[PDB]
Design an enzyme around this catalytic site. Structure first.
Site, PDB file in Angstrom:
ATOM      1  N   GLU A 235      48.835  31.709  34.696  1.00 29.84           N
ATOM      2  CA  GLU A 235      49.866  30.736  35.161  1.00 29.84           C
ATOM      3  C   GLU A 235      50.726  30.275  33.991  1.00 29.84           C
ATOM      4  OE1 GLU A 235      48.071  27.857  37.883  1.00 29.84           O
ATOM      5  OE2 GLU A 235      47.634  29.540  39.318  1.00 29.84           O
ATOM      6  N   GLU A 340      43.923  35.404  41.902  1.00 30.64           N
ATOM      7  CA  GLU A 340      43.333  34.053  42.075  1.00 30.64           C
ATOM      8  C   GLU A 340      43.794  33.407  43.385  1.00 30.64           C
ATOM      9  OE1 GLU A 340      43.613  31.247  38.640  1.00 30.64           O
ATOM     10  OE2 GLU A 340      43.533  29.674  40.248  1.00 30.64           O
ATOM     11  N   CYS A 342      42.130  30.014  46.096  1.00 30.71           N
ATOM     12  CA  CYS A 342      41.103  29.090  46.604  1.00 30.71           C
ATOM     13  C   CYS A 342      41.798  28.080  47.509  1.00 30.71           C
ATOM     14  CB  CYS A 342      40.326  28.385  45.497  1.00 30.71           C
ATOM     15  SG  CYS A 342      41.323  27.305  44.445  1.00 30.71           S
ATOM     16  N   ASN A 370      48.687  40.529  52.041  1.00 35.86           N
ATOM     17  CA  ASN A 370      48.776  41.210  50.721  1.00 35.86           C
ATOM     18  C   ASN A 370      48.648  42.739  50.898  1.00 35.86           C
ATOM     19  OD1 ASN A 370      48.831  39.489  48.002  1.00 35.86           O
ATOM     20  ND2 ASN A 370      47.730  38.267  49.503  1.00 35.86           N
TER      21      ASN A 370
HETATM   22  C1  LIG Z   1      44.285  28.571  39.850  1.00 39.59           C
HETATM   23  C2  LIG Z   1      44.130  27.392  40.814  1.00 39.59           C
HETATM   24  C3  LIG Z   1      43.436  26.303  40.507  1.00 39.59           C
HETATM   25  C4  LIG Z   1      42.880  26.078  39.124  1.00 39.59           C
HETATM   26  O1  LIG Z   1      41.538  25.641  39.239  1.00 39.59           O
HETATM   27  C5  LIG Z   1      42.964  27.315  38.213  1.00 39.59           C
HETATM   28  O2  LIG Z   1      42.748  26.901  36.871  1.00 39.59           O
HETATM   29  C6  LIG Z   1      44.327  27.986  38.431  1.00 39.59           C
HETATM   30  O3  LIG Z   1      44.553  28.994  37.491  1.00 39.59           O
END
Ligand SMILES: *[C@H]1C=C[C@@H](O)[C@H](O)[C@H]1O
Ligand SMILES: *[C@@H]1O[C@H](CO)[C@@H](O[C@@H]2O[C@H](CO)[C@@H](O[C@@H]3O[C@H](CO[C@H]4O[C@H](CO)[C@@H](O)[C@H](O)[C@@H]4O)[C@@H](O)[C@H](O)[C@@H]3O)[C@H](O)[C@H]2NC(C)=O)[C@H](O)[C@H]1NC(C)=O
Ligand SMILES: *[C@@H]1O[C@H](CO)[C@@H](O)[C@H](O)[C@H]1NC(C)=O
Ligand SMILES: *[C@@H]1O[C@H](CO)[C@@H](O)[C@H](O)[C@H]1NC(C)=O
Ligand code: NA
Length: 497
Positions: A235, A340, A342, A370
């Site tokens: 990021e 990534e 969540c 995706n």
């Molecule tokens: C992706 C989303 C949430 C954070 O916990 C993580 O560090 C980030 O890169």
């Protein structure tokens, strides 16, 4: 083989309860005999990859929804599926008794579990750490003489990664990503907040930071671990933001282009790690295609970049066609990879919602979207969290497909685990997305893959409340007469000859 022990926490579905002596398990995947299909079904009502089989019919008649396989229409090859071995995940797993630990690791990494083949490994501390540290915190150590792995790596993450690899029958690919550099390389002299590397690409700060990647790969190699890929930064857009709350390192796309071209590319290429892939971006897809255009239109950066890593957190604002679709069109030989995801990180989301069917549907909807827009793989964030969604040194708590409950020496496998498993269990590395077209407008999400041996895998998600009777046509084999219940996910398997 062993069924779910269901428990409700008052959300829309159940978790499956595991402990030192019991955990639900699957059989290793097989294709059934030619002329027969397998159905694996999970439902909000509580079914967890229940196996049924049915005949393939030579003929079909009627007005119902038809999904027609286009097996000679070929898209991307699949790299795979997995999750992140954060400090927080390692602490949660190791807080369980050793037999419970082994059942958690088997849930993810064995063929009696969901057959993960990717592990993302933070390079030192992130928000999902209880300590802030880098590998080179001794100030002004440009030679990196004081570079070293602390116990978070040598005692927690590395031994768990070895145990995962021992359980995995598939080759596992490790992916490394850094959050912050040593603070003495940074404009702001702090792990968080708005701050970039000092100076400019090609200088002592940038050459030291590039060498830190090689020292990281050297140290993991001394521990008998080799990496498939690294990202240029987690990021990078985060470190451009005033007051960013946790570990970050800001790059504009121009800064990333020149760092790759001048420092990171050449340094990796001139090392024993020259076969490790480099992924750019590792950030929200809203930054595409602009970031890909800035980096990959420079030939001196493009020659070092294998792929483009994307995170899911702005997908709701960033349509797939305009971002992934457009990036694939412009740069069709540069793979897209989801690194990534969540639930729980957004202001309007509670951290943990034990048994949420909605959060399972979010995972499968994301993976299907995706795969339909050329992405070769999909990676969860923390492999396990506690019931608060931690630990996390800035209390940035989120959800995880497995929640540990150390008091009860228990862990809970949530809908997200089963939704990810509907893909990871049945889609080996080297599978290829093929076409699949609907006879009429419908509320289903569906994707078709050709297994390496030529057999068919189809995943069907119904995010609607309504049961949808459905036929699948394979023009070589025949018709699968089936039904997609409201709030279900199915994986279909069948041989083609
Ligand atoms: C992706 C989303 C949430 C954070 O916990 C993580 O560090 C980030 O890169
Ligand atoms: C680790 O998890 C195990 C699985 O949850 C735990 O075993 C369970 O413990 C409870 C309490 O003793 C038992 O519950 C009782 O169950 C019987 C009915 O049993 C049967 O039906 C259930 C549900 O369909 C099924 O799971 C079993 O196989 C049985 O055939 C009731 O009559 C009682 O009133 C009470 O509810 C479970 O039977 C038992 N489950 C299993 C699979 O063994 C174990 O205790 C946990 N370990 C630790 C250390 O906590
Ligand atoms: C399927 O349709 C054909 C053509 O109308 C018919 O002749 C045949 O008996 C049907 N059933 C089969 C091939 O099993
Ligand atoms: C850093 O490494 C050098 C060279 O091996 C050593 O002499 C020095 O004492 C180290 N410094 C710290 C703070 O560990
Ligand atoms: Na939140």
């Amino acid at each position: 083989a062993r069924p779910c022990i269901p428990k409700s926490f008052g959300y829309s579905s159940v978790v499956c309860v595991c402990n030192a002596t019991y955990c639900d398990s699957f059989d290793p995947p097989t294709f059934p005999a030619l002329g027969t299909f397998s159905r694996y079904e999970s439902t909000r009502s509580g079914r967890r990859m229940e196996l049924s089989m049915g005949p393939i019919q030579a003929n079909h008649t009627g007005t119902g929804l038809l999904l027609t396989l286009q097996p000679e229409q070929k898209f991307q090859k699949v790299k795979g599926f997995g999750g992140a071995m954060t400090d927080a995940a390692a602490l949660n797993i190791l807080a369980l008794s050793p037999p419970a630990q082994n059942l958690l690791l088997k849930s993810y990494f064995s063929e009696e579990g969901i057959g993960y083949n990717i592990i993302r490994v933070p390079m030192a501390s992130c928000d999902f750490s209880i300590r802030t540290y880098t590998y080179a915190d001794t100030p002004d150590d440009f030679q990196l003489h004081n570079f070293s792995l602390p116990e978070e790596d040598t005692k927690l993450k590395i031994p768990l990664i070895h145990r995962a690899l021992q359980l995995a029958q598939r080759p596992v690919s490790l992916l490394a990503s850094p959050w912050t550099s040593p603070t003495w390389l940074k404009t702001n002299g702090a792990v968080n907040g708005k701050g970039s590397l000092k100076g400019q690409p090609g200088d002592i700060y940038h050459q030291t930071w590039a060498r830190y990647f090689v020292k990281f790969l050297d140290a993991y190699a001394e521990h008998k671990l080799q990496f498939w890929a690294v990202t240029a930064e987690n990021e990078p857009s985060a470190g451009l933001l005033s007051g960013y709350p946790f570990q970050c390192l800001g790059f504009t796309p121009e800064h990333q282009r020149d760092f790759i071209a001048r420092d990171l590319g050449p340094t990796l290429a001139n090392s024993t790690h020259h076969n490790v892939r480099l992924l750019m971006l590792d950030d929200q897809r809203l930054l595409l295609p602009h970031w890909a255009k800035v980096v990959l239109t420079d030939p001196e950066a493009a020659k070092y970049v294998h792929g483009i890593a994307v995170h899911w957190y702005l997908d709701f604002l960033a349509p797939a066609k305009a971002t992934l679709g457009e990036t694939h069109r412009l740069f069709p030989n540069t793979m897209l990879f989801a690194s990534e995801a969540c639930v729980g990180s957004k202001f309007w989301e509670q951290s943990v919602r034990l048994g949420s069917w909605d959060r399972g549907m979010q995972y499968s909807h994301s993976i299907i979207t995706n795969l339909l827009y050329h992405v070769v793989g999909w990676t969860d964030w923390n492999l396990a969290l506690n019931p608060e969604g931690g630990p996390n040194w800035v209390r940035n708590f989120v959800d995880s497909p497995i929640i540990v409950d150390i008091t009860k020496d228990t862990f809970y496998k949530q809908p997200m685990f089963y939704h990810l498993g509907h893909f990871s269990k049945f889609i080996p590395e080297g599978s290829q997305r093929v076409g699949l077209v609907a006879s009429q407008k419908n509320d289903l999400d569906a994707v078709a893959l050709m297994h390496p041996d030529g057999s068919a895998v189809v995943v069907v998600l119904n995010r609607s409340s309504k049961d949808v009777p459905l036929t699948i046509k394979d023009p070589a084999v025949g018709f699968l007469e089936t039904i997609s219940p409201g709030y279900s996910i199915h994986t279909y398997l069948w041989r083609r000859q």
